[PDB]
């Protein structure tokens, strides 16, 4: 499980700006914070984790302060931008921890490209980032309090909280949901499509079969989300006319027991 806090910031000019955050544990959204809300919203019964109402109060406040301080500091640091203080500015932060039976991260993108990371005890630019960024990151690395606060959040606060999240939403992260499959085809060669939807967790096995012969050339689509946090996936096979008869789609998933789905074309 990877825990990620995802912040998206849009700076249109010197005086219009919005920032929004969404937080994920594995592939389940746990929180949301819109620009127009003073407070973070939980999107899960267990989003507060094993934290006290005061443990949540304090931490929320740290973030409320931070959100204001980030808005104003970027506005300042943007003046130092190369050729001219260029507009629409888009900033993105990905922060959190990769929880193993943990390693933390804090990455920053500017204009859609990864330019900055916090690493160890300080901010550093990434190789091939715009050189105009070096000074802004010097100014920032002079703030010893923030650096200490960021070290505490990454090294200590994040892992502890996430651990509380995992205990609290065990029954949700452990939920098992069954795929339902159906077949179709598209237009003398044709493409056979096996659609597989409504399954959870994400890991799945779909394949066109000719008896016990796995059909290499079965092409898997991408995982597409459904609204209720189940997945959708389809797998296809190119077939000549009269190559259709004898073919089946086989789906294995954790939730089926040892009872695969086999649908015959």
């Amino acid at each position: 499980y990877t825990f990620r806090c995802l912040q998206m910031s849009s700076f249109a000019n010197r005086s219009w700006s919005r920032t929004d955050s969404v937080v994920w544990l594995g592939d389940l959204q746990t929180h949301r914070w819109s620009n127009d809300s003073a407070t973070i919203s939980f999107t899960k019964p267990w989003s507060q984790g094993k934290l006290s109402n005061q443990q949540w109060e304090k931490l929320q406040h740290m973030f409320q302060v931070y959100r204001v301080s980030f808005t104003r500091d970027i506005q300042e640091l943007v003046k130092m931008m190369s050729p001219k203080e260029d507009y629409p500015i888009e900033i993105q932060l990905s922060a959190g921890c990769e929880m193993y039976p943990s390693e933390s991260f804090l990455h920053v993108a500017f204009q859609g490209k990864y330019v900055v990371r916090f690493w160890g005890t300080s901010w550093q630019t990434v190789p091939g980032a715009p050189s105009w960024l070096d000074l802004p990151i010097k100014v920032l690395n002079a703030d010893q309090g923030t650096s200490a606060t960021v070290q505490m959040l990454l090294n200590d606060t994040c892992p502890l909280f996430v651990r509380g999240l995992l205990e609290a939403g065990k029954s949700d992260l452990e939920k098992q949901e069954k795929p339902v499959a159906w077949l179709s085809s598209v237009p003398g060669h044709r493409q056979l499509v096996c659609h597989v939807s409504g399954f959870y967790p994400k890991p799945v096995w779909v394949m066109w079969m000719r008896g016990d012969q796995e059909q290499q050339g079965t092409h898997r689509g991408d995982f597409l989300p459904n609204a209720d946090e189940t997945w959708y996936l389809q797998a296809t096979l190119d077939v000549e006319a009269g190559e259709e008869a004898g073919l089946a789609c086989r789906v294995k998933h954790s939730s089926l027991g040892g009872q695969d789905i086999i649908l015959y074309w």
Partner: protein, 98 residues
Amino acid sequence: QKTPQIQVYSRHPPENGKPNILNCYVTQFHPPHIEIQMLKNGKKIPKVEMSDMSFSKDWSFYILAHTEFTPTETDTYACRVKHASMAEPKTVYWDRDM
């Protein structure tokens, strides 16, 4: 600047007359500013819920739009996307399969 990819599909096997949920997943775009509308017979559907804007490992934005619908043999459904990287809006029709 990244151009939006659009994929359109149902929660459930689409059977004519049977209430379903239609999805429209727009990915691979930048900047985050986008307009999505789901259509029925070329006309905007009013009860379209949307996910929060999120972004991916590769820094590109994605969102999920979805709406209750019932497949029919007389109705066409579509997804229409306006983004600054495109000249005119881009529509993709649901192919009664997905």
